[PDB]
Amino acid sequence: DVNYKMHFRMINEQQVEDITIDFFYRPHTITLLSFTIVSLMYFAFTRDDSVPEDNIWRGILSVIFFFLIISVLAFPNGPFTRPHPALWRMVFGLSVLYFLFLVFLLFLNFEQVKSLMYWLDPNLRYAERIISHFDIFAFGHFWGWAMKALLIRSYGLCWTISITWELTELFFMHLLPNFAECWWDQVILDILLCNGGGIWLGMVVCRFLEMRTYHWASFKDIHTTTGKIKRAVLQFTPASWTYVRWFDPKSSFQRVAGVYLFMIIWQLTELNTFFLKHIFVFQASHPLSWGRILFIGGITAPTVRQYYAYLTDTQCKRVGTQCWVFGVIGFLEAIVCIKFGQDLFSKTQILYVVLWLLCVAFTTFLCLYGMIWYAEH
Amino acid sequence: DVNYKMHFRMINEQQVEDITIDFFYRPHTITLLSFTIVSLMYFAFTRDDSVPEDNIWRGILSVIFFFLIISVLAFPNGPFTRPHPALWRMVFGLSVLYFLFLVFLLFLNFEQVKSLMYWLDPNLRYAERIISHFDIFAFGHFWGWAMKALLIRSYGLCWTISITWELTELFFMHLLPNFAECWWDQVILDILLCNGGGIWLGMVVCRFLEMRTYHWASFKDIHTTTGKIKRAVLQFTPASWTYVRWFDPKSSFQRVAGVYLFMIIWQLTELNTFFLKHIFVFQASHPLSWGRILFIGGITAPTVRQYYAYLTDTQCKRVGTQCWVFGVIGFLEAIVCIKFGQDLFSKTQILYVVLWLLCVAFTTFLCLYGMIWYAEH
Numbered sequence: 001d002v003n004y005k006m007h008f009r010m011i012n013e014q015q016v017e018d019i020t021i022d023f024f025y026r027p028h029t030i031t032l033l034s035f036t037i038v039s040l041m042y043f044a045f046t047r048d049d050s051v052p053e054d055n056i057w058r059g060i061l062s063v064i065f066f067f068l069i070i071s072v073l074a075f076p077n078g079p080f081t082r083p084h085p086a087l088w089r090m091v092f093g094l095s096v097l098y099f100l101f102l103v104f105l106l107f108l109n110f111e112q113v114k115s116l117m118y119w120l121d122p123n124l125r126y127a128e129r130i131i132s133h134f135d136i137f138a139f140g141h142f143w144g145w146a147m148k149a150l151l152i153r154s155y156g157l158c159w160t161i162s163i164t165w166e167l168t169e170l171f172f173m174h175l176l177p178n179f180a181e182c183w184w185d186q187v188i189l190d191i192l193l194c195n196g197g198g199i200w201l202g203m204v205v206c207r208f209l210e211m212r213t214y215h216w217a218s219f220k221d222i223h224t225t226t227g228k229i230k231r232a233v234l235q236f237t238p239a240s241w242t243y244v245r246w247f248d249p250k251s252s253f254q255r256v257a258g259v260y261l262f263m264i265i266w267q268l269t270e271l272n273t274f275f276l277k278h279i280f281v282f283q284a285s286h287p288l289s290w291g292r293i294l295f296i297g298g299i300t301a302p303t304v305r306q307y308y309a310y311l312t313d314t315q316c317k318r319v320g321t322q323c324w325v326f327g328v329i330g331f332l333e334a335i336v337c338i339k340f341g342q343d344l345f346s347k348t349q350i351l352y353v354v355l356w357l358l359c360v361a362f363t364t365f366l367c368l369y370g371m372i373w374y375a376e377h
Numbered sequence: 378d379v380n381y382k383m384h385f386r387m388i389n390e391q392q393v394e395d396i397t398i399d400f401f402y403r404p405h406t407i408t409l410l411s412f413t414i415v416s417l418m419y420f421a422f423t424r425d426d427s428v429p430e431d432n433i434w435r436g437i438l439s440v441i442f443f444f445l446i447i448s449v450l451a452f453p454n455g456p457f458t459r460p461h462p463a464l465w466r467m468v469f470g471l472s473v474l475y476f477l478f479l480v481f482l483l484f485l486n487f488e489q490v491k492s493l494m495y496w497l498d499p500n501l502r503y504a505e506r507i508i509s510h511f512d513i514f515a516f517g518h519f520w521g522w523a524m525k526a527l528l529i530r531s532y533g534l535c536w537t538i539s540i541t542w543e544l545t546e547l548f549f550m551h552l553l554p555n556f557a558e559c560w561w562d563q564v565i566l567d568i569l570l571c572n573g574g575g576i577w578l579g580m581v582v583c584r585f586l587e588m589r590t591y592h593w594a595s596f597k598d599i600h601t602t603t604g605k606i607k608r609a610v611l612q613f614t615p616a617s618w619t620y621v622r623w624f625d626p627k628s629s630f631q632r633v634a635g636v637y638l639f640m641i642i643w644q645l646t647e648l649n650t651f652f653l654k655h656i657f658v659f660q661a662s663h664p665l666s667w668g669r670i671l672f673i674g675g676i677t678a679p680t681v682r683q684y685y686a687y688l689t690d691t692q693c694k695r696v697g698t699q700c701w702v703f704g705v706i707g708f709l710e711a712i713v714c715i716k717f718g719q720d721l722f723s724k725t726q727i728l729y730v731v732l733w734l735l736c737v738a739f740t741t742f743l744c745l746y747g748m749i750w751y752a753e754h
């Protein structure tokens with residue numbers, strides 16, 4: 001049990017190894033205690049609070065900001081400790097904020113949630129060819145897969161969900177009347193280039209990042225300025241890379257069904273994005289659209305490394321807190337879509353979702369066979 | 378530094394020693410995840426959301442409850458580990474909730490805060506002799522002083538602050554026109570009977586608890602039913618008692634100033650209560666008054682034991698998170714009272730507060746002399 005509680009602190013609160021500059025890792029909470037009071041003193045005595053509309057906004061911004069300060073002192077930093085552990089306590093701080101925001105939304109009705117969205121943005125109330133298709137969103141979609149494949153470390157897992165989702169969005173665009181997106185948009189442009197190009201780049205880096213000899217000289221020791229610039233910049237890159245093996249030839253029925261649940265919660269988070277944008281009508285350029293995608297993308301990096309650790313390591317015996325929070329967020333967003341999306345379906349079929357369930361297991365079982373046989377040949 | 382980071386986890390997250398019934402200390406976070414998802418599914422698909430006020434109220438309640446659930450998984454449990462550490466993680470979660478609520482209030486104006494209070498309770502908008510004086514509030518004050526003296530473990534500190542605060546409240550009742558509370562009420566009945574009896578009982582229980590031989594037989598091992606009942610009931614009592622010595626004959630200027638700051642913040646936490654209750658006019662029977670007092674009293678129990686540990690232990694090098702949160706709460710309440718209390722003073726004097734500052738140091742210096750000389754005689 002000494003290992004069973006120590007192995008959780010390698011998942012939940014990964015510690016910094018080989019600290020040389022100790023100014024960056026010594027707490028100053030009393031100075032943080034003195035900063036918050038003087039910060040709020042300036043805002044409680046000099047800010048003009050004569051308008052009620054801008055008082056609620058700045059109060060919300062301050063609650064979010066000062067919850068990030070509390071998260072630095074009290075929240076776990078995941079299995080990541082670069083560039084600083086505190087930047088991952090502040091990402092876990094936003095996960096809890098977004099989790100509790102969804103808990104609130106389940107208890108409202110559609111007229112209150114729509115009135116809430118219009119408060120955030122009043123403009124929401126009133127609302128060759130292939131080359132032009134590539135926009136700033138296609139760049140984000142390419143780098144989303146180049147980051148997912150960086151952590152999943154599998155062609156079979158990433159192409160299984162790249163293909164199934166694009167097939168689903170092609171099918172789910174039967175309801176959407178106005179868009180004229182032809183099938184090649186999400187079967188040739190997306191599956192091949194935006195996804196496969198992203199998947200290829202992400203899996204190419206994993207080979208590089210995991211075969212690299214991680215030798216980290218201290219910043220003070222380097223004498224040449226170009227080395228100091230190299231060392232300063234290299235702080236924002238991983239200090240080590242885990243060797244990921246989702247499947248084993250002797251993998252049990254528990255492990256095989258732990259990668260099956262992994263690729264259902266993965267695809268659940270893609271139905272959340274599709275329906276939240278459709279139930280609450282906002283354009284893809286709105287910060288509610290790509291601001292949420294960036295935040296969920298930031299959460300995913302420590303969640304994939306904590307679900308993998310729990311699933312495989314036999315001395316873990318607890319699932320990391322960030323993976324727990326990414327579990328409620330992904331499940332609650334579906335309940336939000338079912339509750340408020342009671343109207344945009346009349347006779348629509350869940351059978352495709354049921355059919356998607358089988359075609360995922362069909363591809364995990366084929367993945368195990370293609371790797372069990374791989375040892376033989 | 379191995380001790381400098383280990384000594385913080387004896388303050389922040391005190392671990393349970395000698396666990397025999399392991400059902401009470403084995404996490405089930407995935408079962409917690411399933412419970413939260415099913416509960417929110419039931420409340421999202423079954424609750425009638427046709428009234429907005431009830432929707433907002435139930436959303437607030439659910440957010441508080443699920444923040445408590447998050448705190449059970451991700452927040453430190455103080456130096457206390459009885460009856461369960463989770464019941465102190467939840468207290469810390471409530472502390473953070475209140476801290477952020479205070480952060481929000483600084484950015485509103487008085488009309489918005491009054492509207493919020495009226496939303497919380499619409500009834501707030503429209504709003505021999507000694508034997509009759511003793512009410513449930515007097516009983517609560519007596520038990521609060523008993524609990525305080527249970528942790529401070531000092532007649533000098535407790536009597537100093539009791540006397541100073543009673544004098545301050547007697548003085549501050551110069552502004553209060555309607556109340557006819559004569560000086561005897563808060564110079565004899567309060568100082569002697571309620572406060573004095575509480576202090577006496579607290580110090581008697583300190584003497585009993587710190588001289589007790591803490592031997593904890595496992596619940597399963599006891600065979601007699603009365604012994605099992607005693608062991609079950611005894612779980613809600615401290616498993617050990619720290620020997621508290623605020624002053625030493627060789628105590629430096631740092632320690633003396635630390636006790637001075639301790640008592641200054643202690644009296645600030647009473648100015649906060651007085652001025653909050655007077656600025657936001659609600660009766661002492663309203664839950665906003667005694668609920669807040671109960672919550673601050675619950676916070677105080679680990680805050681005192683963490684401030685003492687930081688102040689005296691020389692290997693601590695960090696102040697516990699509950700102490701940090703109590704500090705921000707105590708300072709932010711004062712800032713709130715200053716911001717919204719800009720009107721109920723015209724020519725009133727801070728000199729008494731300044732005079733109170735000297736008469737506290739006068740009584741710390743006299744406390745050290747009365748104990749430095751104590752060794753000689």
Ligand SMILES: CCCCCCCC/C=C/CCCCCCCC(=O)O[C@H](COC(=O)CCCCCCCCCCCCCCC)COP(=O)([O-])OCC[N+](C)(C)C
Nearest residue numbers: 254257258261265266300310311313314316317319323327
């Ligand atoms: C409407 C729909 C219609 C059709 C629906 C039909 C649905 C069909 C139903 C599908 C469900 C199938 C479930 C099968 C589960 C088998 C058990 C299993 O493998 O357990 C474990 C893994 O599993 C876990 O327990 C992991 C934690 C899970 C909870 C956190 C979620 C966070 C998600 C984050 C996802 C991130 C995604 C990121 C994407 C980029 C392994 O077994 P174990 O022995 O416990 O493990 C041994 C190791 N220890 C314990 C010794 C350490």
Ligand SMILES: CCCCCCCC/C=C/CCCCCCCC(=O)O[C@H](COC(=O)CCCCCCCCCCCCCCC)COP(=O)([O-])OCC[N+](C)(C)C
Nearest residue numbers: 631634635638642643687688690691693694696700704734
């Ligand atoms: C308007 C008014 C008008 C007139 C105003 C005038 C005001 C006049 C101004 C008075 C202020 C005087 C302050 C002097 C402080 C000297 C330094 C000192 O003693 O430091 C330390 C203690 O002090 C700390 O640092 C403790 C942490 C403080 C922050 C947490 C707050 C939570 C409160 C919770 C209170 C709970 C209350 C509960 C009540 C029931 C000790 O020195 P050190 O060497 O750091 O310690 C050695 C130990 N280590 C470091 C090795 C471990």
Ligand SMILES: CCCCCCCC/C=C\CCCCCCCC(=O)O[C@H](COC(=O)CCCCCCCCCCCCCCC)COP(=O)([O-])OCC[N+](C)(C)C
Nearest residue numbers: 057064087090091094097098119120121287288291292295
């Ligand atoms: C929070 C948890 C959820 C995560 C994302 C969830 C998805 C939601 C994400 C983003 C959408 C948020 C709404 C923005 C669109 C509304 C219209 C608009 O332009 O508003 C703009 C918002 O401009 C701002 O100032 C926004 C500030 C940030 C918002 C919260 C994220 C915290 C990140 C902290 C990161 C810290 C570091 C982290 C670790 C490194 C400007 O407003 P405006 O149009 O001029 O009108 C303003 C006045 N009213 C009308 C609004 C009253």
Ligand SMILES: CCCCCCCC/C=C\CCCCCCCC(=O)O[C@H](COC(=O)CCCCCCCCCCCCCCC)COP(=O)([O-])OCC[N+](C)(C)C
Nearest residue numbers: 434441464467468471474475496497498664665668669672
């Ligand atoms: C939270 C952080 C701050 C702490 C305290 C700060 C001080 C504030 C404290 C208490 C004051 C709260 C307001 C209550 C008075 C208003 C009028 C009234 O009677 O309201 C009642 C409130 O009844 C409830 O249901 C209250 C639920 C609890 C509230 C939060 C505390 C969480 C404790 C969790 C402890 C868990 C375990 C902890 C560890 C073991 C009933 O309402 P009503 O009159 O019928 O009208 C209802 C409808 N409207 C009008 C309200 C819309």
Ligand SMILES: CCCCCC(=O)OC[C@H](COP(=O)(O)OC[C@H](N)C(=O)O)OC(=O)CCCCC
Nearest residue numbers: 017018019020021024083084216218219232235239
């Ligand atoms: C702005 C600073 C640029 C970078 C300046 C710089 O020299 O960084 C070095 C520091 C610490 O580096 P060490 O070599 O002491 O620890 C190394 C440790 N064992 C490890 O490899 O993890 O990095 C940070 O904390 C960066 C905080 C970034 C804050 C955003």
Ligand SMILES: CCCCCC(=O)OC[C@H](COP(=O)(O)OC[C@H](N)C(=O)O)OC(=O)CCCCC
Nearest residue numbers: 079080081082083236237238239240241242301305
């Ligand atoms: C400004 C921030 C820039 C991004 C900062 C950055 O690169 O660090 C993020 C982490 C760093 O990994 P560690 O060395 O802390 O953990 C090591 C552990 N054994 C492991 O498996 O990595 O890696 C990623 O998630 C890389 C994907 C990008 C995620 C956004």
Ligand SMILES: CCCCCC(=O)OC[C@H](COP(=O)(O)OC[C@H](N)C(=O)O)OC(=O)CCCCC
Nearest residue numbers: 394395396397398401460461593595596609612616
């Ligand atoms: C309702 C249960 C009544 C009490 C039933 C009972 O038998 O309690 C024993 C348990 C654990 O007691 P142990 O002897 O295993 O540990 C002892 C440990 N080393 C120590 O001394 O701290 O206490 C709780 O967790 C109580 C949780 C209360 C949850 C509110």
Ligand SMILES: CCCCCC(=O)OC[C@H](COP(=O)(O)OC[C@H](N)C(=O)O)OC(=O)CCCCC
Nearest residue numbers: 456457458459460613614615616617618619678682
């Ligand atoms: C339902 C809850 C009932 C109250 C539960 C209860 O009595 O436990 C609270 C703690 C228990 O102390 P521990 O044994 O965990 O810590 C031991 C550590 N070395 C120490 O110094 O105590 O003690 C107090 O604060 C007592 C004051 C009352 C506080 C309200």
Ligand SMILES: CCCCCCCCCCCCCC
Nearest residue numbers: 091287291294295297298299
């Ligand atoms: C881990 C990454 C977290 C980043 C949070 C994303 C929030 C972006 C908000 C953008 C709002 C822009 C308003 C004009």
Ligand SMILES: CCCCCCCCCCCCCC
Nearest residue numbers: 468664668669671672675676
């Ligand atoms: C550590 C103790 C925490 C207790 C929280 C106190 C909150 C009480 C609220 C009572 C409201 C009653 C409304 C009728």
Ligand SMILES: CCCCCCCCCCCC
Nearest residue numbers: 136137140284285286290294
């Ligand atoms: C009209 C389209 C606007 C898209 C803005 C994208 C901003 C990307 C910021 C990325 C930060 C990491």
Ligand SMILES: [Ca+2]
Nearest residue numbers: 166169186190
């Ligand atoms: Ca697509």
Ligand SMILES: [Ca+2]
Nearest residue numbers: 543546563567
């Ligand atoms: Ca009084």
